[PDB]
Sequence to fold (517 residues):
Amino acid sequence: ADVPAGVQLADKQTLVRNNGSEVQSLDPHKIEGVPESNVSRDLFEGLLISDVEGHPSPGVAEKWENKDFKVWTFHLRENAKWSDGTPVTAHDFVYSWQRLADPNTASPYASYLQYGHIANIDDIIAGKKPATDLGVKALDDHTFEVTLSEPVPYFYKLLVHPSVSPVPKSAVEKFGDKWTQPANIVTNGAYKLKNWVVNERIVLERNPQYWDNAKTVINQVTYLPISSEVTDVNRYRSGEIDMTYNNMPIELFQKLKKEIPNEVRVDPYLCTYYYEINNQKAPFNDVRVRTALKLALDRDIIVNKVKNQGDLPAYSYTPPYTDGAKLVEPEWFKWSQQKRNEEAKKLLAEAGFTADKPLTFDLLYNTSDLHKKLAIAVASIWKKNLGVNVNLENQEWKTFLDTRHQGTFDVARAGWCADYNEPTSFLNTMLSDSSNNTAHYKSPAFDKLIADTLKVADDTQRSELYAKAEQQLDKDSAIVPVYYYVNARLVKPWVGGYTGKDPLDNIYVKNLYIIKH
Ligand code: IUM
Ligand code: IUM
Ligand code: IUM
Ligand code: IUM
Ligand code: IUM
Fold:
């Protein structure tokens, strides 16, 4: 943390943050969500980290170079250490990236190494080459070298993500699944795991071995698993919580803006809210059904009437303001909602649906007041505009992600937040073989478009290709885009260091501080 001159710090430097739900895990290779990454950033530190404004900056690597954007060499700081005092070395990175690549690890982010194009990743994921064949090597204890199969100019931007953070071989090997328990875990970020009570709290304490520990101000941070946005706001206003999670309750938002305007933080966020259709399950494997659902949803109503928190109506997966996005607004987005509804109704009629045999399916969402209200609104709009019936079903976050990976669903609410600020952070997740592809969408045309982007060595061709890839997804109605998120949350006046300028919201508690109050 960089405490401004003049600021008086509170005696007790402790923070309580709501985290939306119980995390899937504390193992960097077993996680896929925002709640999981929030805690991961404080415990595990990769090559690079985002600074307080979101810029890729030195993490364990103090400096790095590239040879033709294909061979990347990272010089690891000599004083990087694990919480047990053992040095963080390039070998920890080799082991970790190999474990992420290994099919036996079944990481939901195994494809992250495909996104970066590390050599031999495809064969490894396919079980054709051992994970030890991965294009990574430790040249010495402090030098990690990565070899890509093609030039990737934005490669280093990917490195702040939790999936490429190091894991301690020794604990993993000795305790297996239990390596993350407080008594077994070893971490290299600014914090260490103190306590972990499922469905109650996660308590982290400063890691004195952290290379930059002298600049860490908060001594303890608690992450809570409250999925009720109203409860999160209530516990924030009663004084228990210093930072709510970033899901704001429809019940109280407009009033909060009026009552505590200075605490209501609303900033740009590279995330898209959409309804994920299971593309491999009938009748969702019929583009007419998918298109109808996509068109009959009234984004203006949901965005301006139902949520009304500042989100923007969406017509694509990748947010148009992603660095490198130069998207074309589809024609249907310009039509009136009545025109969209007619088209929608006509398509389902063509698909064989009738009042006697209507389209009925499930709408799955992770337990939340905000998601439930949105799902109820969507159910009402689809019923009224298209004559479709939906059964709402809520599941706890960890279960919900598992259900989407299993494909045991019809339609699910969904949010995708960028991992790096470049369109492929989103587009890569729709690749037929992507480990993050819970839409179960497989398009050779789509795959081709993205493969070609690293075959051209100029940004305009790349941007055009991304625009075309979005058009392909839109033509196939792979998803139902709803809105581009705004990052809205409450932050007490005494919490310093949260700028709100990082569109990825990659917060590190080591950068915050408690002002005296
Ligand atoms: O690395 U360039 O356009
Ligand atoms: O630092 U560039 O094209
Ligand atoms: O900030 U730019 O490619
Ligand atoms: O309607 U149903 O899986
Ligand atoms: O607080 U209520 O749906």
About this structure: The radius of gyration is 23 Å. The longest strand covers residues 264-277.
